[PDB]
């Protein structure tokens, strides 16, 4: 037996504040990518990319894809200013 990557690692959300119409790289919403394997990849969950076209408080979900194929879902928040 062994611990799969999504059990070993503990990604934590970073709250970002961005301007209306800003781009959002999913990795930028994870606070501790230095505590996760550097070959992990980050993407927005389908249907859960924060929409920066309007200002307000938005929610999103980051998928953290680990090298062993397991995946962590991370709830994040994005403040959009106008
Ligand atoms: Na985890």
Author numbering: 226 to 307
Task: Tell me what the authors wrote about this structure, in their words.
Proteins attached to the surface of group A and group B streptococcal human pathogens that contain tandemly arrayed Rib domains have been associated with invasive infections and proposed as potential vaccine candidates. Here, we study Rib domains from Rib, R28, and from a surface protein from Lactobacillus acidophilus. Together, these 5 structures of homologous Rib domains, and further sequence analyses, show Rib is an example of domain atrophy, a rare event in domain structural evolution involving the loss of core secondary structure elements, and also reveal the remarkable structural malleability of this domain family. The structure, molecular dynamics simulations, and small angle X-ray scattering of a Rib domain pair suggest tandemly arrayed domains are likely to form an elongated rod on the bacterial cell surface, thus suggesting a possible mechanism of immune evasion mediated through domain number variation.
Structures of single Rib domains with ∼38% sequence identity were solved: RibR (S. agalactiae Rib; amino acids 230 to 308) and R28N (S. pyogenes R28; amino acids 230 to 307). A 1.8-Å resolution structure of R28N was solved using the structure of RibR as a search model; the Cα root-mean-square deviation (rmsd) between RibR and R28N is 1.0 Å. RibS belongs to the “Rib” subfamily, giving a Cα rmsd value of 0.6 Å for superposition with both RibR and RibR28N, versus a Cα rmsd of 2.3 Å for RibL. As predicted, the Ig-fold D/E strands missing from RibR and R28N are also missing from RibS but are present in the RibL structure. Antibodies against, or intranasal immunization with, Rib conferred protection in animal models of GBS infection while antibodies to R28 conferred protection in an animal model of S. pyogenes infection. Cross-protective immunity has been observed on immunization with Rib and R28 against strains expressing the noncognate antigen.
